[PDB]
A paper describes a structure:
After size-exclusion chromatography, [name] was incubated with saturating amounts of ATPγS (1 mM), a slowly hydrolyzing ATP analog, and plunge-frozen for investigation by cryo-EM. Remarkably, data collection and image analysis yielded the structure of [name] in a hexameric, closed, substrate-translocating state at a reported resolution of ∼3.2 Å. In agreement, ATP-bound [name] subunits interact with substrate via the conserved pore loop 1 aromatic residue Y674 and hydrophobic residue I675. The remaining two subunits do not directly engage subunit and do not contain density for a γ-phosphate and are named ADP1 and ADP2. The organization we observe in our [name] structure is consistent with the proteolytically competent conformation, where 310 helix is unfolded to form a substrate-binding groove and the serine–lysine dyad formed by S1015 and K1058 can be accessed by unfolded substrate. Situated at the base of the protease domain, the C-terminal helix is stabilized by intrasubunit hydrophobic interactions among residues V1118, W1119, F1123, I1125, and L1126 of the C terminus, residues F994 and A1028 of the core protease domain, and residues L952 and H953 of a loop at the base of the core protease domain, hereafter referred to as the CT helix-interacting loop. Unexpectedly, in our reconstruction of substrate-translocating [name], we did not observe density for this yeast-specific charged insertion.
[name] protease is a conserved ATP-dependent serine protease composed of an AAA+ domain that mechanically unfolds substrates and a serine protease domain that degrades these unfolded substrates. In the [name] matrix, the evolutionarily conserved [name] protease, or [name] in yeast, is essential for stress tolerance and proteostasis. An adenosine triphosphatase associated with a variety of cellular activities (AAA+) serine protease, [name], modulates [name] DNA copy number and maintains quality control and respiration. Of note, [name] from [name] is defined by a unique insertion of approximately 50 highly charged residues between the ATPase and protease domains.
Author numbering:
A (entry chain E): 529 to 841, 895 to 940
B (entry chain F): 554 to 841, 896 to 940
Write the structure that this text describes.
């Protein structure tokens, strides 16, 4: 039952001795009492971890670059970092799990780029959303004495990937509930995200340590003034600047319009949207740095186009140009009309920065 | 156990207890080192200038040389992040000819991880101190308590700080009295080492039992020495890059100190050197002469053209302005 896996995964020596002692204990145990049950659960958890199997590391720079570039446009820094990672891994023959954090305004694409990075690196992807924790139990687990004892989510992630050296995407670091007594997950993350302590994670449910030095931890936060200094010191932060209007237009025309059209039932059949319409929607409706509300606006426009196509059942193709844009996405809401045609004495125009952008 | 059968759970409880008792190194100790120069050498090949800690270890060896008993004190380290207050532990254990065990106390908030539970429970296990002793299979080990400040002072269902204070008692340490192993165990030989950042969090009764050594950060000159001696060769090795080619000049490291790294630790410096050599390796891969030069005049192409120099500074002081000094994390101001 348990022999084939432990044969095929090449487990380290210490865990091998622990497993041998465990089966020696089980040989003298019977199903009558709960000791056999807890021992069987312990052995199942021990065997679930992919102790000595990794993935096929990426070796081709161009194909990895093309995999990265087919889903995101402007993240030159992240793509360059991944290319450098691949280049370093090629010259050694081995890989090291570096810790990297992404910071930027919402909608820039911090969470979505993780799947593309994992696919380019040929690493199995697991996303761990940690915004709402108040206790360390989800990180370090619970001792097997307790009935409600489950390993930490890192061990469960390693089991789910069924292969060591995964990519673990930690979705929120800013939202981490610091609280007080009854638990502090921040120090648990310090233990997890230490560049030199990854070899001795030492989960509570599994007294044997596990190796995390190969895991490519990817974090994601919106601000940088909430994270404790010890946690921030062990993290390599990459800033994600918000997209420019021209960059937003290119992102739209290259990824959002085809995707929204494909998912609206009008895929490459009837409806197209002009560049002037995109520029107007950028200037008068979506002045932010992200591309979330722009995506919502495009999806609404294409949904209305699909409804019109269905109900109506002129011209061969329907145009959503700037002139008729207000009848699809409503009246403009970000018109700039508080200016002065001729500034009177005492008034001076200044500049400001907000989360939306320039003001 | 001689009058027990595998049918009932009494046999299982007794065999588990016997295995735990026989696994513990009740009487065997480690062989203490008596060579002060050898210990100094083996301490100086991993860290550059942590003079106070090295002197403390040398004094420990010297005082152990004058007796036969290897008394284990409670040394406690406090300093800014990235000063090597955790990486020293392994080298210290190697110098003391002891076995090293690390015990992270970052998120642990239950006394069951320190004292364990009674044998009455189905899956009771001893605390991490007894498990550390079992793993080392020797007395007087080096147990490194990795986080003293970040315990939370205990919430409900346990107060781990009080239990740790019970463990770290300089005088009444010979009777730890584990809850699972319900007889006293001699912890007076174990060497305990902290890893802490702020001294204002530890409770006074716990802080009074620990000998605190202040681990002040590194000066820029010490930073360049640490870089060129340990970080630049290691970062270069960690990306291939061996055979008589690209390296970082001394002026490049000086400019990195002056314009990029003004902290007290050497972690951001490690990041900058790692990214420099990472970009160098990427260039080497792309180009498949093999010599690349990195200096001051082309340093803001690898760690980023952005810098960290303003210096404030009026060219000439007008009447009314006075230049005082202020203390900051980034050196001074
Ligand atoms: N460069 C880009 N190319 C294509 N699509 C993009 C790009 N940047 C963002 N998007 C899209 O915009 C949306 C942003 O969602 P995503 O969760 O990735 O953002 P985020 O900044 O990580 O979010 P949050 O901070 O709320 O967690 C997604 O639909 C994503 O596909
Ligand atoms: N004085 C020093 N000489 C040589 N290397 C050092 C020195 N101080 C730190 N380092 C190196 O810096 C890196 C980080 O050190 P380490 O992880 O021990 O930090 P720390 O001070 O324990 O951190 P924290 O306070 O955040 O827990 C390691 O590679 C270590 O070898
Ligand atoms: Mg799509």
């Amino acid at each position: 039952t348990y022999k084939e896996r432990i044969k095929s995964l090449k487990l380290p020596d210490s865990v091998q001795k622990i497993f041998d002692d465990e089966i020696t204990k089980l040989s003298t145990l019977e199903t009558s009492m709960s000791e056999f049950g807890v021992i069987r659960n312990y052995l199942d958890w021990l065997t679930s971890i992919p102790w000595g199997k990794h993935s096929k590391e990426q070796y081709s720079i161009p194909r990895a670059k093309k995999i990265l570039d087919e889903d995101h446009y402007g993240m030159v820094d992240v793509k360059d970092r991944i290319l450098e990672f691949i280049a370093v891994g090629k010259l050694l023959g081995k890989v090291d799990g570096k810790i990297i954090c992404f910071v930027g305004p919402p909608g820039v694409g911090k969470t979505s780029i993780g799947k593309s990075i994992a696919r380019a690196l040929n690493r199995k992807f697991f996303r761990f959303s940690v915004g709402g924790m108040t206790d360390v139990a989800e990180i370090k687990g619970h001792r097997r004495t307790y009935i409600g004892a489950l390993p930490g989510r890192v061990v469960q992630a390693l089991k789910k990937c069924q292969t060591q050296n995964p990519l673990i995407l930690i979705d929120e670091i800013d939202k981490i509930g610091h609280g007080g007594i009854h638990g502090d997950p921040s120090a648990a993350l310090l233990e997890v995200l230490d560049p030199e302590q990854n070899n001795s994670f030492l989960d509570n449910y599994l007294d044997i340590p596990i190796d995390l030095s190969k895991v490519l931890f990817v974090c994601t936060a919106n601000s940088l003034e909430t994270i404790p200094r010890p946690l921030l010191d062990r993290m390599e932060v990459i800033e994600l600047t918000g997209y420019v209007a021209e960059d937003k237009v290119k992102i739209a025309e290259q990824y959002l319009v085809p995707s929204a059209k494909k998912s609206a039932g009008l895929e490459n059949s009837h409806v197209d949207m002009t560049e002037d319409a995109i520029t107007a929607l950028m200037k008068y409706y979506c002045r932010e740095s992200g591309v979330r509300n722009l995506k919502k606006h495009i999806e609404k426009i294409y949904r209305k186009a699909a409804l019109q196509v269905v109900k109506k059942l002129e011209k061969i193709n329907v145009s959503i140009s700037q002139k008729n844009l207000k009848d699809y996405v409503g009246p403009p809401v970000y018109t700039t009309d508080r200016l002065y045609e001729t500034t009177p004495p005492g008034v001076v125009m200044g500049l400001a920065w907000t989360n939306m952008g320039g003001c």
